[PDB]
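Batch manifest line 174
LIGAND: zinc ion
JOB: complex structure
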Amino acid sequence: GNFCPLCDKCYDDDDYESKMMQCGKCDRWVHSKCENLSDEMYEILSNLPESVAYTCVNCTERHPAEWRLALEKELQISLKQVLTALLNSRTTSHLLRYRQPLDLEGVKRKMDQGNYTSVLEFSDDIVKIIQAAINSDGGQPEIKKANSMVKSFFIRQMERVFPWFSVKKSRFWE
Ligand SMILES: [Zn+2]
Ligand SMILES: [Zn+2]
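JOB STATUS: finished
ARTIFACT:
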């Protein structure tokens, strides 16, 4: 019988819906619900498991656990990858870098200080900035065309780095 070490429940009869992660050292599985992990962090881990190298309680050596540090780090590197891509675009930067962060520079300062703890927080901050700009940059034709280009560029960057994340469903899009 294969049991989750954190609830002691056998998972042999667990249905497909049971979200779990595998320990890379002993191949045993652990329920996401039994671990200190949010839905987001579970998906980040599951999208690229080898980057975190999760280890169960029986195989974990140090505290805090190495996998936890690795996963936290991964989140930060991923957020930075998205912001860097946006800032490296002249047009996007022109429109959004310089005007709760109110511009991309504000997001950069908040991020560099390691203040972002979730993808949704980071995403919403940026969606709000983009939508605010779209709502206020006027009606010049080139501006109208750029508005859609910028929104799409952001969505593409988020889908590349966080494919499991619903950026299109942000409550802050109008
Ligand atoms: Zn469990
Ligand atoms: Zn293990």
